[PDB]
Amino acid sequence: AAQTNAPWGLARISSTSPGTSTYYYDESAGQGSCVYVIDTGIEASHPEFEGRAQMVKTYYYSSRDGNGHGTHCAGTVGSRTYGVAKKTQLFGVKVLDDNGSGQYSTIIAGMDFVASDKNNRNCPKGVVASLSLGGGYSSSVNSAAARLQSSGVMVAVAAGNNNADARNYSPASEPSVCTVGASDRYDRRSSFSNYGSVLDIFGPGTSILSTWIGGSTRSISGTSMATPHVAGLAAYLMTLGKTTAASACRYIADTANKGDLSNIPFGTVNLLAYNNYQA
Numbered sequence: 001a002a003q004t005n006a007p008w009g010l011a012r013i014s015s016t017s018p019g020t021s022t023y024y025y026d027e028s029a030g031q032g033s034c035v036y037v038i039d040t041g042i043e044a045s046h047p048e049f050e051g052r053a054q055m056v057k058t059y060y061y062s063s064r065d066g067n068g069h070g071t072h073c074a075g076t077v078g079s080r081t082y083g084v085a086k087k088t089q090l091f092g093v094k095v096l097d098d099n100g101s102g103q104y105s106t107i108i109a110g111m112d113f114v115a116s117d118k119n120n121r122n123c124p125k126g127v128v129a130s131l132s133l134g135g136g137y138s139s140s141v142n143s144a145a146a147r148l149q150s151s152g153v154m155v156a157v158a159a160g161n162n163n164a165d166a167r168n169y170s171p172a173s174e175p176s177v178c179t180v181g182a183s184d185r186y187d188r189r190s191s192f193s194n195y196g197s198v199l200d201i202f203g204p205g206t207s208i209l210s211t212w213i214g215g216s217t218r219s220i221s222g223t224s225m226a227t228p229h230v231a232g233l234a235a236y237l238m239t240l241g242k243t244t245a246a247s248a249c250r251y252i253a254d255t256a257n258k259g260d261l262s263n264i265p266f267g268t269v270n271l272l273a274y275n276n277y278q279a
């Protein structure tokens with residue numbers, strides 16, 4: 001299948017070279033798999049979700065996304081127009097407040113929640129967890145990320161936006177999960193993107209068009225926008241039966257576009273997420 005005039009990040013992921021505008025993907029599009037978006041919530045009623053999104057847990061007074069960040073991330077994962085895995089099932093876990101902040105204890109609880117909750121859901125092709133959040137190093141936050149990964153969920157986390165070594169940031173520094181860096185439309189490392197040896201792959205993160213609260217759309221940047229491109233790609237590959245939750249990160253790194261990125265510091269991988277679609 002082909003999505004003509006797709007957002008640059010979608011075209012990039014199904015292309016070997018930058019500058020294309022069609023997103024080519026397998027029509028299965030992630031159906032059968034499930035992606036948990038652990039953020040500010042998701043506006044499930046947004047028409048781009050087609051009834052495929054649902055709030056499953058909140059840690060605040062309401063489960064609605066009063067921020068927009070989570071709705072944005074969920075759109076990149078699987079909205080009709082801005083999503084990587086167009087037929088996936090989206091579940092929202094609200095661990096961040098409407099200002100986009102949350103505490104470590106609530107973020108850890110959200111992760112333990114998903115590890116248990118996936119057992120009452122029908123996700124025959126696999127379960128993915130998308131975490132476009134992070135903070136200063138915390139061993140308990142890293143540990144919650146590792147438990148989720150070991151429970152059988154593909155965990156993808158943002159590298160962080162401090163233009164620094166991701167080793168001092170959490171969930172990012174957890175070596176068992178998939179740490180995602182951001183890139184721009186010219187194949188340059190996003191200027192704000194963290195880097196370092198803990199990163200596993202890079203995804204499109206500069207000026208990413210996606211859904212927003214109030215039934216709208218908005219273009220924003222961050223390693224937070226790169227994370228969902230790889231969570232969505234993992235869900236698509238798992239439903240294709242190419243990989244599993246436990247090895248999806250490694251399979252993505254193995255099949256990525258290698259050496260295409262510029263501004264990659266010595267010691268950071270130069271791997272760009274790629275679906276390897278051939279019609």
Ligand SMILES: [Ca+2]
Nearest residue numbers: 016017257260
């Ligand atoms: Ca190339």
Ligand SMILES: [Ca+2]
Nearest residue numbers: 175176177200
């Ligand atoms: Ca890793």
